[model samples]
Target: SEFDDWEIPDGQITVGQRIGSGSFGTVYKGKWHGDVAVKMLNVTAPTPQQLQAFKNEVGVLRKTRHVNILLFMGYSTKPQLAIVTQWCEGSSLYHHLHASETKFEMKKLIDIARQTARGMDYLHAKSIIHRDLKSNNIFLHEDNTVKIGDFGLATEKSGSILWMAPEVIRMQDSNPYSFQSDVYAFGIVLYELMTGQLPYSNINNRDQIIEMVGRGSLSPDLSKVRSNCPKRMKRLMAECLKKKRDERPSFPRILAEIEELAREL
Candidate 1:
């Protein structure tokens, strides 16, 4: 019902500057009754499997109703395939953290974690596995409020290298991505928020990352994060990054720890 209802006629959209791109398509700044981010599909002609798969994701993504998750505006199919959503003008959390002039205080950082996790918890409740969860997908507005990006629509369960769990890195497609995989990635995001640095910056190639991270031989050193970062938080992050997927806590449990830290700290 929602998928049928949320369609935007091709004529209603007018593109502006190109904002982003991926194998799936390019994201453009666009107008469609408001400021919108249009993720235009690059499909020359999607196979029935691809188009149907996209439909399934849209079905789930449209039902997501959370403030921290990206707001799905609508989609267009007549001229070009595009996903319309609210645009965050302040760029991604990764870009902001990497910027030398801007920095986030501990309190602000905690809030960011809380919002992202809360949003993710909701997704899990809806049976949505966000196979991709990283600082880049975490958007920040002018006020630095969080808005987690779209579900892993354009991406697959192959997962990101540095943030991936051992199981995901092992490429067990039969088992693919699950909620625990996202928690593992969020643990990496926690590291980024605390350090304002990229994960495994020293490792240059995929092979190297897969060697250390893929095998669970190494994880981001907590020593690199803020010295004053709460012990509870550091411990929770470590727990989130447990090598065994089953050992990792659910987002609800993770949210409890973070919400407690918010009060205690």
Candidate 2:
């Protein structure tokens, strides 16, 4: 019933500037009653299967409501298919940590990571896996509050190889991704926040990164992060990077550890 009711309320959207793009489509800054982010599917590109898949993901996402997760406004299928969500004017965590001119304090960095972990914990509780949990999908507003977004690739089990667990990397389609895989990606995100570097930045090619990850050869060096970053945080990162998915802590456990670390910061 909810899925059938997911369509955008007419006259609520006023399209504006282009914000971001991916293989499926481009997201634009717009007004959905007020400020909002509208993701429009590229009509020229989406195969019928792709369109159905996107709609299916949105059906789940529309019901996903959490402070740490993106707030959905509605969806539309008039001239084209588009999903609307609350605007995060400050943009994504990738920009703040890597692309923006602004620098963050140690405490702020920990807070962001903690909040992101809390969000992931909520998703895990709901049995939803954010297949793609990279820095690019973590949005930050002007207050520095973080929320996870961009579920274009979110699914029960499937995501990018670079942030994928060893099992997913080794088996590909044979192995189903789980919450543990997200924990692995969270480790990579923590590394990204700490060092303002992407995982395998030294590698220039995607195939190279995949090969390295498959053989379990390359991983982030915690030492490269700020020398003063909490030891607990470093330990958590190491645990999340464990070769076996089961070796990684559950999202609730990870959240508790990070919250404790945040209190001390």
Candidate 3:
């Protein structure tokens, strides 16, 4: 592995309580030289694709270094393939919005949204597209600093269908995803932060959601946007959800708009 320097020898890690899980594997609050989050791949009967994804994740983490991005500490690939990162005591923004008892004011929500946009700006600047840019993948430190995580699906042309851009869902194999698709998902995340609900929550079936999104019929209900939220914020959300890929603002534009909105708040 090119990241041989970041590898941790076996038995040095002390695994603790399970912190999270996904289709790929389970994450635990663990220790490796320091308190860390251990994401271990489910390779009991590993397949080639899973192995490749694991390797891709490691590669991405190795090159990713930003204040709003998860910091890679070390890993182990012998007994098990696991990537260790800085432990976020504040947990994920998803839990904070849906699971935790903590309630956020409009000011805090704008701050969270701005921090997330800044992170996305950095990722796009590096030419890395975070395909799955949902609240669950956005982590928060104890001090309220937000970091984007879960790069297992960070490939350029793929991502969760629900949060996907219209062009991404309709694009042919020849046309790969771009930064605009990520901007679309960021809009969804902003919707979640503002409304405290999932987009198209009323729809229960995956295929139906895909159908609507494919036809450009799906979008966050703007009426539900918090009353305290600025109208410009709603307008930006609508712009990000535009059916045409070209309509979505560039990350630089999005960042500037968010910064201005944050100041206004």
> Clashes in each model (backbone N, CA, C under 3 Å)?
0, 1, 0
207: Cα error in model 2, Å: 1.9
Q: Least lDDT summed over 10 consecutive residues: which range in candidate 2?
A: 151-160
lDDT tens digits by residue: candidate 1, 78-101 = 677788888888877877787553
Q: Judged by lDDT, which candidate is best?
A: 1
**What ranges in model 3 sit over 4 Å off?**
1-3, 43-60, 152-159, 170-176
What tens-digit string does per-residue lDDT give for candidate 3 at 1-265?
4445667887789999997774367999998767889888776765667766666766777788889888888778766877788888888888888787468998988888899888899888988877667888799888789888875435522236767887777663545467888889888888888788777778778777777787888766878888887888888888888888888998889889989988875
Q: How well is each residue in 164-231 modelled by candidate 2, as lDDT tens digits?
A: 77666767768457889889999989888777676666667777766677778867777788877889
Cα displacement (angstroms), candidate 3, residue 87, comes to 0.9
Say which candidate scores most in TM-score.
1
lDDT of 3: 0.79
Report the poorest 10 consecutive residues by lDDT, candidate 3: 151-160
User: Which sections of candidate 1 miss by over 4 Å?
Assistant: 1-5, 47-53, 99-101, 142-144, 152-159, 172-175
Query: Which ranges of candidate 2 are over 4 A from the true structure?
Result: 1-6, 9-12, 42-59, 152-161
CA lDDT, every model vs. true structure = 0.80, 0.78, 0.79
